[PDB]
């Protein structure tokens, strides 16, 4: 009846909120002021997961460029304190960020997130499932933390050191009231929205094999747990709130599903890469798409069962 949005602006809304219900994710970047050359990649991880019985498994869907989510298991009721979060990469990492973290910014120079979503589709029958799926969102933010290190010299010398760390991992152990708690066989479906007023570009970090960089103690980095990226490397953190999915499976239950993670990211192509030829301009500013983006954001439930995606 009265949708006076630019097509791409409207498409941006379909992209952010209802990713799976179209033939193709409309897929056009953020219809905001920036109109430069962008390479919008629509990442999607379609994986078959079998949750280990007797443990809670965290699937932290965080806005890190190549990685889909970070996974970690802990005994039911235990705390993921020293428990490292391992990277579950989106397909085709090596083809965008290269093999090593020393050629990461070869094809792409900066990034910015347009959408983030995840869904767990249970494939167990009515005689084998058991457990729960709980979803809440954590406000992860990157920080440059300080620590002093003593180097063993004649008189030992104390150095003032830094570490790129991530704030908020402590929430990884507390289910807030803002949560979705349901049975396993009604997998979830949630999507997060932008963390700030504007969608600004972030540079692509290099040399980061784990969040507390290699050789830094979890404690020196003042962090709760560490994030480990094997092969894949830490490229940066976007402006989305991490979607935390916690699946608790009892011993003796068979909880299987199809994990799906979506993420449309706008990258700044490096003139030197072959991918530069696929780059197109960002959609023009559509204050209506951006206004609707936020109302829909407010009136949206933290997570829904599969059926309502």
């Amino acid at each position: 009846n009265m949708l006076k949005m630019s097509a791409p602006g409207l498409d941006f809304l379909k992209c952010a909120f209802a990713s799976p219900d179209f033939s193709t994710d409309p897929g056009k970047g953020i219809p905001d002021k920036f109109q430069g050359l962008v390479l919008p990649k629509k990442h999607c991880l379609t994986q078959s997961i079998t949750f280990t019985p007797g443990k809670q498994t965290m699937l932290l869907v965080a806005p890190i460029p190549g990685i889909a989510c970070l996974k970690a298991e802990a005994n039911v009721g235990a705390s993921f304190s020293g428990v490292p979060l391992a990277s579950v990469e989106f397909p085709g990492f090596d083809q965008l960020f290269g093999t090593s973290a020393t050629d990461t910014a070869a094809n792409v120079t900066a990034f910015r997130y347009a959408s983030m979503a995840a869904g767990v589709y249970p494939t167990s029958n009515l005689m084998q499932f058991a457990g729960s799926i709980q979803v809440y969102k954590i406000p992860l933010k990157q920080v440059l933390n300080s620590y002093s290190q003593t180097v063993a010299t004649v008189p030992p010398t104390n150095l003032a050191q830094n570490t790129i760390a991530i704030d908020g991992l402590e929430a990884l152990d507390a289910l807030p009231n803002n949560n979705y708690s349901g049975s396993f066989i009604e997998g979830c479906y949630s999507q997060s929205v932008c963390n700030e007023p504007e969608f600004e570009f972030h540079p692509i970090m290099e040399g980061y094999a784990s969040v507390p960089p290699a050789n830094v103690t979890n404690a020196q980095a003042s962090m709760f747990t560490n994030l480990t990226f094997s092969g894949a490397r830490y490229t940066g953190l976007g402006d989305m709130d991490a979607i935390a999915i916690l699946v608790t499976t009892p011993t003796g239950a068979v909880n299987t599903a199809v994990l799906k993670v979506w993420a449309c990211v706008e990258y700044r192509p490096n003139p030197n890469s072959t991918l530069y030829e696929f780059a197109r301009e960002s959609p023009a500013n559509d204050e209506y798409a951006l206004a609707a983006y936020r109302k829909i954001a407010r009136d949206i439930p933290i997570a829904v069962a599969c059926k309502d995606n």
Binding site: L13, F17, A18, P20, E287, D308
Partner: peptide, 17 residues
């Protein structure tokens, strides 16, 4: 109903701006 159908109703309901 699909997520899009609900995103719709929110739009239909009103935006002052």
């Amino acid at each position: 109903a699909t997520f899009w159908e609900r995103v719709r109703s929110i739009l239909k309901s009103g935006l002052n701006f």
